Amino acid sequence: MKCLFYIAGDVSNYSIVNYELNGQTQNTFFAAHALYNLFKPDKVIALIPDSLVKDNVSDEECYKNLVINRAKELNFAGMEEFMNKVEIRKIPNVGIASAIQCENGAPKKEKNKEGREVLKRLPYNEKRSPIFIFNAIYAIFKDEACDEYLVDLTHGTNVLVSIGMNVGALFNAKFYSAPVMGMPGKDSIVNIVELTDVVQATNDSLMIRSSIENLDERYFKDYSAKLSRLNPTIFEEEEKKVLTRVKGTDVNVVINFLWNIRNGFTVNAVKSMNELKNIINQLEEDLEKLKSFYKNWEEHKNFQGETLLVLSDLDSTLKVKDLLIEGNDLEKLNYLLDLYIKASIYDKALSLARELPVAICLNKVGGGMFDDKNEKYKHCNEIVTSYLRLRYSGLMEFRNTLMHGGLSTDMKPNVDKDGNITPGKIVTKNKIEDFVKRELRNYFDKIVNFLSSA
Amino acid sequence: MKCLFYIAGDVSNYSIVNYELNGQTQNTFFAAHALYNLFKPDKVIALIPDSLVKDNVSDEECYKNLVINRAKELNFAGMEEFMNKVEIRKIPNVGIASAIQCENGAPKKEKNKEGREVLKRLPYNEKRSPIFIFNAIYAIFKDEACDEYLVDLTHGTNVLVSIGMNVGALFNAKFYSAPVMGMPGKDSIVNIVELTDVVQATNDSLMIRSSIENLDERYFKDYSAKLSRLNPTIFEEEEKKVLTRVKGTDVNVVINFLWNIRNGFTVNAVKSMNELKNIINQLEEDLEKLKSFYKNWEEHKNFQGETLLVLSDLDSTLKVKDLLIEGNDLEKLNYLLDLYIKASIYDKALSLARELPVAICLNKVGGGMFDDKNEKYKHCNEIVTSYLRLRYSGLMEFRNTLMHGGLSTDMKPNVDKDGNITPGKIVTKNKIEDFVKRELRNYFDKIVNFLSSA
């Protein structure tokens, strides 16, 4: 079931216009109705700020009438069957504001000196926390028990619109706003902007940045499809050049790189680091071009209506450069070890710390396969394992524990007659954390320094 | 290098008022100015929207001057360090607007019937995608090469303020807005809201929800400290009882649960399932109370200045319920197995898939410790290990491969004298993904079904 939320703003000012989206318009005066008529939401929620409108009796009914009174001053069609269905929720606000009074069920008047006016004279000053407003709006949103969320940010302060945005963001809301910018009077058409793609673009980028940070590809948003269907109707020879370049950037290689690093295919990931260096070096110059293009945006108005191309998605992808290093595969794996310590992926860091000295040893002796049939390996492993069980006894103990997990001979849990397990060792969250993140890099360098002589 | 970013909008309608924030009071008509004084930003970016100014040779100074002209008009004592040391950048806009048209510095006046205010252009056919505006603003933000980002959203349209916020979110920007809404009058005590916490609150919630989805405590934002310093001054008894309840919710248990699930301490993760069922059941009722509190926010005006309590942080924590099940530790580990398949954590799923049948066997034979000294275990393991080596050759091969990783005897890579390494048995991302996510559960159930007979 669809749900449409809107910010009340002020209905007394604005007039009749032609609100349009997707080549379809509506004959109305207020933003909310145009969207309502086009989308057919099962519920419609109004957000009355505590400042604007104060009835004493029922602020909920006062606005309900304030709307009908502006409909009858322009003699509009319908808007009465609409009003019955709308739920009206009071929302807080902050700062000085033009607060209008309400006598019992309708706004009182106020002759003033010349014209005709309502009650609006030094009616509001209030200091609030925006998180309070946030919580209040969140509460309303949560309790509506909606499936599809639709938000109208047309009216209301930059503070309420921004707050309303962040709330809606947590309900996967489609955001809409009609840029007013004064008033056209009658016979003017207004285009409703959709601010959902901008909100997704930013989450996508924050998530993509953590994929790299925490070596986890499950957080990387695959904008390959966004790029594949990206093809505007009008384009110059310089912009067609760069858009064809961006359209074919191998994002899947970046995703695969993360998948290998995550699942511990350390050898495969290290071989790629060169391919990726080239992928991101091409993306860097594609992006620098796209940047001067958007820095001098007025010369390039072709992208003016294009949605699918978003800089943040690509720029956030360039962070994968932080995962690459130059050198031989052994030097690349050495850096990968550090990366596994930085992101707190303890198990992969330990296995790499314990096996990398064997591959180092195998290089010193001219090379060989990581097989028990290989003589060079057979002894290299024996030296590492033994020097490794003589000193650095702890490293192996941890690596083992983490490899097998809680349900294993290394943890010695006890299964009872009934079906309940009682552990046999204590999960030392802090000696793992402390050992890996502090001592282990030193314990590896000390090992590697020892086998250099070999 | 601190960089203050703000939307100029119109300076002609700004009254000379006073600004307060964190015990510091600066008096300027526009918020940016005030913000400059107390923050002392190394750079100041004006972000001039295209619609509000229109000049032939270079409008970037038209505004430059529009500001200076409104300063000398009411004889401002400051503006010296601000002006001539402020950058300006041209930014796009949507809908219908158009305003101030200028020559070579200063705005063009008009007489009409009565008055002497600047003639504003009326047509504004600018239909452009918000993502375009987003990219254009992003470009400006990226290229300033700033360390600390500060954004002023007090000025600007609901579309620009929202777009500006999503950009500023990607630069770890402290957001500020001075709520006006109507004419406030010269020399008015107006304070500026900080929206940074609302923007963090939402990212924190999206991340917390992911931490639960992907069984990764690295994504869980620990709001324990936020909750520990949460002490409002005036609070009614009903408010104090509920706030003391929330203030002492064991978020660390939720974090620990995720840390164990992530690092494969499967027994401990399952043991604490019951504790957490109670933690979240207590949180559910605290949250339901906190909800009606914020639904009837007009009655709980004690929290209106409170910034440390955030509903979204707690509500997102309730998602951890999706990780819990009821039953004996064996039934609890069985669910944990599927959770490991759902989140694509292949390594832990396989280990649990292999060892869980052993513990299942151990239960049938009256119980025993997961030690080689235990006879019941010794043979249970032998049956499990053999049946898999017999019927499920595959599982045992993948489990082994993932435990040791690419650089090991299970992958057989080969080291060269140069140090270049080539992967051996080379296993594909889709071989693993498909096996685990498709055939792995059925294969477990088949093993489990067999050992029931034992």
Numbering used by the authors:
A (entry chain A), B (entry chain B): 1 to 454
Authors' description from the paper:
SisCsx1, as other members of the Csm6/Csx1 family, is composed of an N-terminal CRISPR-Cas-associated Rossmann Fold (CARF) domain connected to an α-helical higher eukaryotes and prokaryotes nucleotide-binding (HEPN) domain by a helix-turn-helix (HTH) domain. The SisCsx1 monomers are curled around the two-fold axis to form a dimer, and three of these dimers oligomerize through their HEPN domains into an equilateral trimer, thus assembling into a hexamer. Each dimer contains a cOA4 binding site at the vertex of the triangular assembly, and a catalytic pocket located 70 Å away inside the triangular oligomer along the two-fold dimer axis. We show that cOA4 binding activates a cooperative sequential catalytic response in a hexameric SisCsx1 complex and that the RNase activity is switched-off by Ring nucleases, which cleave cOA423.
A cryoEM map of the complex at medium resolution was used as a model to solve the phase problem by molecular replacement in an apo SisCsx1 crystal belonging to the P21 space group. The Cα backbone built in this map was later combined with an iodine derivative of a better diffracting crystal of SisCsx1 in the space group I212121 to determine the structure of the apo SisCsx1 to 2.9 Å. The cOA4 binding cleft is formed by the loops connecting several secondary structure elements of the CARF domains, including residues in loops spanning residues 6–18, 28–30, 47–54, 92–100, 153–158 and 178–188. The conformational changes upon cOA4 binding induce a reshaping of the loops, so that the oval cleft observed in the apo structure shifts to form a cruciform pocket, in which the cOA4 is bound. The active center cleft comprises R354, D372, R389, R399, N400, M403, H404, T409, and D410 residues. The SisCsx1 dimeric arrangement results in a symmetric placement of these amino acids, creating a diagonal electropositive stripe flanked by two electronegative regions on each side.
